[PDB]
Design an enzyme around this catalytic site. Structure first.
Site, short mmCIF file in Angstrom:
data_model
loop_
_atom_site.label_atom_id
_atom_site.label_comp_id
_atom_site.label_asym_id
_atom_site.label_seq_id
_atom_site.Cartn_x
_atom_site.Cartn_y
_atom_site.Cartn_z
N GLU A 1 133.60 -27.33 -69.33
CA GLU A 1 133.21 -26.04 -68.76
C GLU A 1 133.08 -25.08 -69.92
OE1 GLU A 1 136.16 -24.69 -65.90
OE2 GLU A 1 135.69 -26.23 -64.46
N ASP B 1 140.44 -14.14 -64.25
CA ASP B 1 141.10 -14.79 -65.36
C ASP B 1 142.48 -14.22 -65.66
OD1 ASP B 1 139.54 -16.99 -66.63
OD2 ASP B 1 137.93 -15.50 -66.41
#
Lengths: 249, 405, 398, 248
Positions: free
Chosen positions: D50, D61
């Protein structure tokens, strides 16, 4: 009937002079020193002594007297010390009136204070924040105990108020203030034969002499306090100069 | 409309007889200008065009009417009584003082005066006066003690942004006392072009009556609103008392409602037994002070005792003479509230209703909570919330340990 | 008619608004949207809100003709809509009262919100105290360290305040942490969004709660002036105060609508917050609108002397109204704003928020343009007590 | 018509294991070091890489990834650097998809980004702030340029939205997160046979094995960045442990 201060002015006008009227505040720089100072005024030729009652919230007063009264109060000066200063001045052959804001008199009792001032040899009261409109109690106390009652007039005083202030006064009328002062004295003379004392930040013999041409008494305070702060000898010398200034003959 | 004159003093300023409370305990040097202002106000207070001007500024500029808010979340702390807050905290400038300075600044203009002077302690009346002067294009000079100016940098700055000159008085004790002294002297010298904007319902006649007249609107509005929301007249109306303008303003409309209790709450500082308080009625006695005969804190010689409160606006050793009359007459009760009671109420009002009140106003809230307990469940108490507490956030934050060290 | 579709889009295929959010937030966003749809048409809700607006917040705010500004505005007639007089000192009280009532109708016991210099946080803490909701405000650490008194207000009101040290440590990252809290705490927590931006339903909901400004203003100007105004104007950060005053006038075709945004040192300098003047379309905090962004689409740092107009985005309903030609958006510099601030203090005795001073400055220029006798309503979105120190430094009074 | 990542999940399930899916952000600690790290992931046993596009406002995040993307942006990372990373991974024989917030894609142009990702060898896009509700342009470009589309689901997802999100996904669905992961995975399972990837902040060998018991892909991001920060050799070693974890 004659005012208590009438004979002083009668006597002054017979010697072609104005009365010298000297203010000092009780307790500046302390109580004994103020009494020695007021005694010295009598010895140096003050005809009338204004004994000042220091007050916590004086409205009328300039910096010199304000700093002095604040010092007096820091020293613990009491209203009854003014009564003691009056006794001392009377003992020295002086003539004393008391100058005070009205609240201390109210707190004392108006009749009581007039009784005790008279008993101390005081000849009268100067009331810089008491106008005639509020003076009912004082006039009765003034009559009862034979005290002169000196109200103030100002350049801005209306004809109606000048007349009422003069009519309610006994002894002299205090004309508090370039040409404003003689004009004010002139306006008083038009309605009454009462003696007029003039205060005008007098600091010198020459100034006292100018005022003595048109006024019955020359009032001096700030300059005496300034003199006293230097010392007792300076105060004596200034008072002598001022006493010579009030004499025209 | 020109409102009735049943509770007004005589022509000399006296309440309760020709030598009673109030009057003019001032020098003859001030009397010309005091009479000019008196005659001016006698004319304008019955002038429909003056009242329309003032009403118009009250409505559109200041934001009147102020609402009445039932603080239901205080109830449990007031013995389950109902506390309604008259919200002067929402006025332009954040207090009832705007009502006063709008009236007087309009009056100054009617008198042809080009310049207005005033004095201030912590700064509230100074800011209010400068606000009204900027509005009406009047030159403004505010006298303020040197110790206050160095301690109130942002209020001095507000006044200057508003176009006013701030004169820091550096003589004497450099406090309010010394500023008052310079203001009165400026007035006498500049009487021909200058108007003096008195700060409270005190001073010589005509100021106690005039200031009260400009604050009457609070009570007028409140009397209609409380009957609207509660369905009846209140069991009590209460306010904090410095000089007395906000209190007298809210009380006046209720004076002839004999079932309505009237209670004024005064600053007890550290406590009335400690000699650090401003509890004029509780500990003072009759005397002449700042132009009127009323109650004051004074020593055995008649000297003014220095007062103390955590709030600037209640830290005053006197009180307006109309309050003295109403006390003597049995119509209004006056009661002490400590710094601690006031701060507890400040905090409570913040948490419970989201309203940060002036510490002054918190004395009335604290008072109201106690009266609630006295009067009990369902009792209806109107409280004058005289100001917002933005100015007090730092004091309150220190009190409650929110700034650390 | 002015509302978006069910997905939150204004203007059909241009697609202003929408929900550019993670799936993790969608359960709670659908939940607020359903609840807002039910409550916006419930008479009990609207009554409760109207009662709080009147008795608690002090509505209506007045409309004041500032006749002493007129000479500085080409002799136009500037009317100031006085949101500065609301409880808490700005228009933000309108939004938080509505959202807070909704939160209580939803059964949520906890409310979170973001704040920059502290205004929205104080407003949110205020509403939560009123209604007995637990309150946590997120504030960037650069801001908490220099807004100690606003933190103290929030705490006095019973709110917790979290200093955020992630990213820039400013507004946009407080926002980011508040979205993370909402995810974890969605069962019991309501997110009180502070402007007319974000994912649907917030642009519409915040606007609906601010509409009262314009509804009052329209009535009041007709009453005082005898006619609809020539222009209605407002400062534009995220867009809540501007959309609130504009909305009631959208269908009055002779009323010019102008939003003024912050140009900082000037648009050509790079130190500004002029979202429409210098930004471009993009997705930011859940909404497709105009954005200050670099050429990869990274958020650009914005600058204004006003902390409230210092938001790099703008609400999608304004982007739509810009595209439709209905509202004009124009830059005002720090200098213009501050000159207007001073002038309002001196002329009317009103100390405006520095945000609101951008609008006043724009109105002075618009007055010179429209001429003598023109009628300009200006949203005076806040009071300037919070800005006295900033203004005092600017004018050298310290 | 089958997905691009389809055969990787086939090969994994044939070999009795879950896919190891490793995330790193482009530009951390600089661009060349980031590419060498992603290359080393391929050499150490990552089945799918990724490639993270650093974004100024990454709301999904945690701090490990946020601080690294912040550092990467401070160093001047560009979106094109991400496309170069995809190309290097593809030439090294590895399988790359891109993970990005949506605004960089809008600024690039959705169609152009899809075109250029396809030209780099990239196999799909993971879209943490694009829901199917806003994905019309993405669906068109996905089909046109033959890229997989990995939408996220969550524990909170309603049955209606979970079904719609799974329906719009190709390649795999990213289940992002006590017993919440296996239930989430189980709910995807009950409506589709699409592979599912699970991120649970995996730190170690034992944690990866625990997740390969129910999930088709084990996703690892935070731990890879923390290992890289220590050094490339620590990344290789950790990646070797996690690859040994997924075969259990």
């Amino acid at each position: 009937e004659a005012s208590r201060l009438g004979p002083v002015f009668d006597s002054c006008r017979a010697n072609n002079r104005a009365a010298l009227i000297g203010y000092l505040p009780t307790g500046y720089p302390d109580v004994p020193a103020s009494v020695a100072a007021m005694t010295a005024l009598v010895e140096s030729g003050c005809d009338i002594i204004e004994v000042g009652v220091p007050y916590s919230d004086p409205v009328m007063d300039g910096p010199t007297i304000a700093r002095a009264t604040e010092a007096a109060l820091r020293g613990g000066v009491r209203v009854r010390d003014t009564l003691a200063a009056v006794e001392a001045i009377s003992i020295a052959g002086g003539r004393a009136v008391v100058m005070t804001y009205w609240n201390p008199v109210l707190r004392y009792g108006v009749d009581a204070f007039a009784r005790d001032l008279a008993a101390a040899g005081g000849l009268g009261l100067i009331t810089p924040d008491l106008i005639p409109d509020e003076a009912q109690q004082w006039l009765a106390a003034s009559e009862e105990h034979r005290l002169d009652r000196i109200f103030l007039v100002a350049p801005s005083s209306t004809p109606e108020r000048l007349a009422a202030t003069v009519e309610a006064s006994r002894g002299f009328v205090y004309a508090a203030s370039s040409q404003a002062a003689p004009e004010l004295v002139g306006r008083v003379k038009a309605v009454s034969d009462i003696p007029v004392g003039v205060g005008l930040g007098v600091r010198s013999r020459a100034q006292a002499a100018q005022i003595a041409q048109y006024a019955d008494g020359v009032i001096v305070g700030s300059a005496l306090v300034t003199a006293l702060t230097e010392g007792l000898p300076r105060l004596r010398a200034l008072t002598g100069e001022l006493a010579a200034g009030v004499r025209l003959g | 409309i020109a409102e009735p004159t049943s509770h007004d003093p005589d022509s000399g300023g006296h309440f309760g007889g020709p030598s009673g409370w109030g009057g003019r305990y001032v020098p003859e040097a001030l009397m010309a200008v005091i009479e000019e202002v008196t005659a001016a106000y006698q004319k304008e207070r019955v002038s429909q065009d003056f009242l329309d001007d003032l009403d118009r500024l009250q409505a559109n500029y200041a934001g009147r009417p102020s609402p009445l808010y039932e603080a239901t979340r205080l109830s449990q702390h007031a013995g389950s009584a109902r506390i309604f807050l008259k919200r002067e905290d929402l006025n332009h400038t954040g207090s009832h003082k705007i009502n006063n300075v709008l009236g007087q600044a309009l009056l100054a203009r009617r008198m042809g005066k080009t310049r207005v002077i005033a004095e201030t302690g912590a700064g509230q009346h100074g800011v209010a006066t400068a606000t009204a002067c900027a509005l009406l294009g009047l030159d403004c000079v505010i006298y303020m003690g040197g110790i206050d100016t160095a301690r109130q940098a942002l209020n001095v700055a507000r006044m200057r942004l508003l176009g006013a000159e701030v004169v820091a008085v550096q003589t004497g004790s450099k406090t309010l006392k010394d500023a008052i002294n310079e203001a009165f002297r400026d007035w006498v010298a500049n009487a021909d072009n200058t108007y003096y904007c008195f700060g409270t319902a005190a001073g010589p006649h005509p100021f106690p009556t005039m200031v009260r007249d400009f604050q009457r609107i609070i009570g007028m509005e409140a009397r209609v609103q409380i009957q609207g929301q509660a369905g009846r007249l209140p069991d009590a109306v209460v306010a904090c008392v410095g000089g007395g303008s906000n209190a007298i303003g809210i009380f006046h409309a209720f004076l002839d409602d004999p079932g309505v209790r009237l209670v004024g709450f005064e600053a007890a500082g550290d406590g009335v037994e400690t000699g650090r308080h401003a509890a004029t009625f509780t500990a003072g006695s009759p005397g002449a002070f700042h132009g009127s005969f009323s109650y004051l804190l004074q020593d055995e010689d008649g000297q003014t005792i220095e007062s103390h409160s955590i709030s600037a606006g209640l830290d005053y050793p006197g009180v307006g003479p109309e309050h003295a009359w109403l006390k003597e007459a049995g119509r209004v009760d006056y009661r002490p509230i400590t710094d601690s009671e006031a701060m507890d109420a400040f905090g409570l009002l913040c948490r419970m209703e989201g309203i940060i009140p002036a510490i002054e106003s918190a004395h009335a809230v604290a008072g109201a909570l106690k009266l609630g307990v006295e009067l009990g469940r369902g009792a209806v108490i109107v409280v004058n919330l005289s100001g917002r507490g933005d100015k007090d956030v730092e004091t309150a934050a220190k009190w409650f340990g929110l700034l650390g060290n």
